[PDB]
Amino acid sequence: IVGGYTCGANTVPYQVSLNSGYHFCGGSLINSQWVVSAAHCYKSGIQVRLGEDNINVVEGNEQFISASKSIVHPSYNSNTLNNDIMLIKLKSAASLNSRVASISLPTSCASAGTQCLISGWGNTKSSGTSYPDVLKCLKAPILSDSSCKSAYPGQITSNMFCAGYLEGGKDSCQGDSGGPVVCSGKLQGIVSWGSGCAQKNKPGVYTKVCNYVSWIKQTIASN
Numbered sequence: 001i002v003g004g005y006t007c008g009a010n011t012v013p014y015q016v017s018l019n020s021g022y023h024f025c026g027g028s029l030i031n032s033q034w035v036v037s038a039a040h041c042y043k044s045g046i047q048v049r050l051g052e053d054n055i056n057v058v059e060g061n062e063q064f065i066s067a068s069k070s071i072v073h074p075s076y077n078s079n080t081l082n083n084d085i086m087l088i089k090l091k092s093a094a095s096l097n098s099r100v101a102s103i104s105l106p107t108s109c110a111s112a113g114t115q116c117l118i119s120g121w122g123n124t125k126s127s128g129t130s131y132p133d134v135l136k137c138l139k140a141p142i143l144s145d146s147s148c149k150s151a152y153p154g155q156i157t158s159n160m161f162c163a164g165y166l167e168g169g170k171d172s173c174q175g176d177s178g179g180p181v182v183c184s185g186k187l188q189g190i191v192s193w194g195s196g197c198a199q200k201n202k203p204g205v206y207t208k209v210c211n212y213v214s215w216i217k218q219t220i221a222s223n
């Protein structure tokens, strides 16, 4: 996250870290057994780390649970990033508490102008490279379809939205991938892509979660 703030420990209780020897992506806990992330975060050998603040220090609220199964969306295209969503099942159910909690799925698509919270352990510099240990946060609005399209000609599908600031300075960044965009207590986006971080006229692009709720529910019901 560039241009964000320190969230505070365990203040974003649905935020997980995906670890394969090191943090490599965010995700969102959506029930005791399942996490939502980006398809471009897929790999084998994932351990889900819940209850994290400092990802380099055991602070006392963590739960570490290995994935039993990954399900990339049927229609994910890794060249266009259309349908950039996957589900990860945990080998055991997480203990839910005030610091480890699921985030609700949307029942309707959010509108441009809605305020959201984006979080993660990604790079905090737009030029340069510095990875934080503790979780960073950013409040950012959803941008209109038209302005998203204008920023990225011929790249924004109906499964994507932009959020952030056209003036730049405040955005998600590499290592935030797969993490949440939460708006009014609902998971509306997944950190997906963009062009650099926090550049003028290049806001973040996010997977539009409301389009995937019935796939998510049916997948959970049979897996």
Ligand SMILES: NCc1ccc2c(c1)CCO2
Residues within 6 Å of the ligand: 171, 172, 173, 174, 175, 176, 177, 178, 191, 192, 193, 194, 195, 196, 197, 198, 203, 204, 205
């Ligand atoms: N600035 C949005 C954005 C830019 C780059 C990036 C990500 C997000 C996740 C992977 O790398």
Ligand SMILES: [Ca+2]
Residues within 6 Å of the ligand: 052, 053, 054, 055, 056, 057, 058, 059, 062
């Ligand atoms: Ca920790």
